[PDB]
Design a protein around this motif. Structure first.
Motif, short mmCIF file in Angstrom:
data_model
loop_
_atom_site.label_atom_id
_atom_site.label_comp_id
_atom_site.label_asym_id
_atom_site.label_seq_id
_atom_site.Cartn_x
_atom_site.Cartn_y
_atom_site.Cartn_z
N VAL A 1 0.93 -1.02 0.03
CA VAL A 1 -0.07 0.25 -0.27
C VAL A 1 0.98 1.04 0.05
CG1 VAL A 1 -2.31 -1.09 1.17
CG2 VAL A 1 -0.65 -0.06 2.10
N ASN A 2 1.99 1.21 -0.81
CA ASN A 2 2.85 2.08 -0.29
C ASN A 2 2.72 3.25 -1.36
OD1 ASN A 2 4.52 3.62 1.56
ND2 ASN A 2 6.88 2.59 0.94
N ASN A 3 2.19 2.91 -2.11
CA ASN A 3 2.37 4.04 -3.36
C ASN A 3 0.22 4.71 -2.77
OD1 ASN A 3 4.01 3.02 -4.68
ND2 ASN A 3 3.23 1.71 -6.07
N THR A 4 -0.66 4.34 -2.31
CA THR A 4 -1.86 4.70 -2.51
C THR A 4 -1.35 5.51 -0.69
OG1 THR A 4 -2.21 2.99 -0.75
CG2 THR A 4 -2.35 3.10 -3.01
N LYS A 5 -0.15 5.99 -0.79
CA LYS A 5 -0.02 7.40 0.47
C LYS A 5 -0.14 8.43 0.81
CE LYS A 5 1.40 3.69 3.49
NZ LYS A 5 0.61 3.44 5.27
#
Lengths: 44, 85
Positions: free
Chosen positions: B1-5
């Protein structure tokens, strides 16, 4: 009398391939009625 | 989920056509590769309004809190039994 010289477990020499299952079928009349989860299967 | 931050500002995609020589993707859009990154929604909205870009905003979609139980795989009476493991 007392005997400690012979092997008394000679019954299993005469067991066939359906001994266990015929014993379970004989035991089926003695048993308590099973509990139910209320459904026929978890896919019901 | 590190691109949905983070928040992103992209633009509407314009025409990409086939280069007659090589078949490459020729474009006439300068803003075709422009992706801007913002910490919040309001920073992106202030930056779009500052530059006169008409924008539209999608809201952040989080995954909702799930209810998990490993013992629920082996219930006595519920359908949530597993048949394999």
């Amino acid at each position: 009398p007392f005997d400690n010289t012979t092997y008394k477990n000679l019954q299993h020499h005469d067991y066939s391939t359906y001994t266990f299952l015929d014993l379970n079928l004989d035991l089926s009349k003695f048993r308590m009625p099973q509990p139910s989860s209320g459904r026929e299967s978890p896919r019901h | 989920v590190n691109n949905t931050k983070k928040w992103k500002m992209e633009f509407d995609t314009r025409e990409r056509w086939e280069n007659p020589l090589m078949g490459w993707a020729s474009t006439a859009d300068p803003l075709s590769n422009l992706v801007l990154t913002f910490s919040t929604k309001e920073d992106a909205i202030a930056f779009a309004e500052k530059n006169g870009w008409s924008y539209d905003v999608e809201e952040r979609k989080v995954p909702k809190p799930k209810s998990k139980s490993y013992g629920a795989n082996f219930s006595w009476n519920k359908r949530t039994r597993v048949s394999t493991k």
